[PDB]
Design a protein around this ligand. Sequence first.
Ligand SMILES: */C=C/S(=O)(=O)N1CCN(Cc2ccc(OC(F)(F)F)c(F)c2)[C@@H](COCC#C)C1
Ligand SMILES: */C=C\S(=O)(=O)N1CCN(Cc2ccc(OC(F)(F)F)c(F)c2)[C@@H](COCC#C)C1
Ligand SMILES: [Cl-]
Ligand SMILES: [Cl-]
Ligand code: NA
Ligand code: NA
Lengths: 320, 309
Amino acid sequence: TVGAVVVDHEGNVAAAVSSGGLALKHPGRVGQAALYGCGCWAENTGAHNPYSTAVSTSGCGEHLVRTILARECSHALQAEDAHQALLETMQNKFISSPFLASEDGVLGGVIVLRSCRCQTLLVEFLWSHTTESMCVGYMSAQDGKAKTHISRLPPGAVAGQSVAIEGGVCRLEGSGSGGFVLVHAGAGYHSESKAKEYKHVCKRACQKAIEKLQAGALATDAVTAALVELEDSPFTNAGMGSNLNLLGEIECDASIMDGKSLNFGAVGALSGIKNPVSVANRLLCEGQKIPPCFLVGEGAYRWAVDHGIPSCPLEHHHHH
Amino acid sequence: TVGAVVVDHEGNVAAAVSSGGLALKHPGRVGQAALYGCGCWAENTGAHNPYSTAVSTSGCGEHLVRTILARECSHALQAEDAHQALLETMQNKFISSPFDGVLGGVIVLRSCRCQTLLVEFLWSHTTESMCVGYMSAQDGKAKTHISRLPPGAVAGQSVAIEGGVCRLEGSGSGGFVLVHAGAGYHSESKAKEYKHVCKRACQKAIEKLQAGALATDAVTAALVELEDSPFTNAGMGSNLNLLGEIECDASIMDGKSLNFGAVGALSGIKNPVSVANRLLCEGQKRIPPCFLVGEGAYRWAVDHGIPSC
Ligand SMILES: */C=C/S(=O)(=O)N1CCN(Cc2ccc(OC(F)(F)F)c(F)c2)[C@@H](COCC#C)C1
Ligand SMILES: */C=C\S(=O)(=O)N1CCN(Cc2ccc(OC(F)(F)F)c(F)c2)[C@@H](COCC#C)C1
Ligand SMILES: [Cl-]
Ligand SMILES: [Cl-]
Ligand code: NA
Ligand code: NA
């Protein structure tokens, strides 16, 4: 599972997530990366909530679905202390949820950003996870150098039971064409090898999002360009290199949310398309112009092909 | 879209929903009846919420998805005034949501111990009409009712809300069920058949409860009866998609275990709720799947002996 969250120079936020799902899963199994409220969330500031907030999840399985975690994090981040709010959410609504009571260990994570104007923009960004490790990258259009970091649980922590949480704060000039992106290449077991490859795909994903923002793109188009980069790494469980299901086939889940319009696009159990996030983003894009927001399986593939999204007929399965 | 909510003689609740989705939808479009939190919700009383609560939605489109309505209703029903809470939610988190005119509805129940069991049940809709049925194991006669918007109301802008109260003896093998056959345009004809299918749905759920069945099996038995009516947009008679085929969404949640099962874009299976219930039942025993779609869901259903069509 890979993810990204973006804020543009106006405080418009977007979020997206993409995943291959569990290895050896039954065909047609859909997990959190496709599910509204669960895999990602983006919500601009409004009357009821003073921050623009964007959230994307990491890890896989049903833990992130049962707790509707991305939306839960977004709502908690309307409290003053963002760090305390996220930590409480991870401890109380994730690790100690009653929805995961008979579960021995809860494995997952989030990337978060929230912004507010003060004309300048204050951006707080955080990551948190209960896995051994998580790889993040982040970048603002002004700093012009992506930063990458491998977040680990400290000694004495217990994976699936302890929380790690880190973050930072960034002030932007909301005058030009700037913004900020935070991405993650996955949260799971530590891997000393390929650790450099996860950091470098996070660096490249941040750069693609920043370049889109610097060319005037919408936050949804910038967060999508970051996820395309993350998907395309053979080392991430999303897009190319996704875990194979029980029949040895690839089935991808992906979704995206726009904070300004609150519209959403998602695909589930999608095979034969190089970049599942591209279909979710196109579903969101066409909805802006009742249009569908969530397509699965054969229908999602045919819809993607009819909208000129690069396909793979040899990688597409249609059982009957 | 059809739905049911059940509470058993112990106060365990369950909820389920099933739908054919939008007429002429693009193949593979999945709507609220398959989506966790959106189509149905069931949650026994716990530390954060003093009532056991079950919710099932009605209508189609994406309005019920965008507001995660079933869970939202469940959380609002933790306030004292259940009627006020549901109305506020329908007006504030549904009609006036930040997410011109929104068409849908809900059935809800909430229960608490007093050894006696107090069950409050409500339905609400912004559609012209909605057909519901309800029954307790003690009264032994199902009641069906057509809820309509009052004169002068405008569908998608006004709210209708009604409900009742039921006291159960929490000692025997009783319970209570509330069902709906859909919320949409009023139909003077076939209204008798919508009431009749709700009546049969309640009786099946009550019969299961009286045989010692779980609340999830009882709510499943209600939805199987609702699906099989050619007049409901679920199971048999589902709206055909853009290519002239049936693709069903269904889900079910257990208040006691909080487990969940769901199918989306399911073709070729007579009773989609049976598959969702079977996914839930297998989960009770690596994390087993709770949400299957498309050809994979069909193959799983047939491999588990669930009748095809
Ligand atoms: C949005 C579409 S739907 O929710 O699938 N849908 C609404 C309900 N329809 C049947 C129905 C209409 C009105 C009812 O109330 C009554 F008038 F009081 F009877 C009712 F109970 C059910 C669905 C029928 O779709 C076509 C078919 C089959 C559509
Ligand atoms: C449920 C499993 S998953 O969320 O799809 N998944 C977890 C992440 N995996 C790759 C990964 C591991 C560790 C990382 O951080 C670290 F150690 F610092 F480098 C990381 F960034 C990514 C993922 C890969 O699975 C096989 C593939 C491809 C599995
Ligand atoms: Cl599986
Ligand atoms: Cl459609
Ligand atoms: Na990949
Ligand atoms: Na039917």
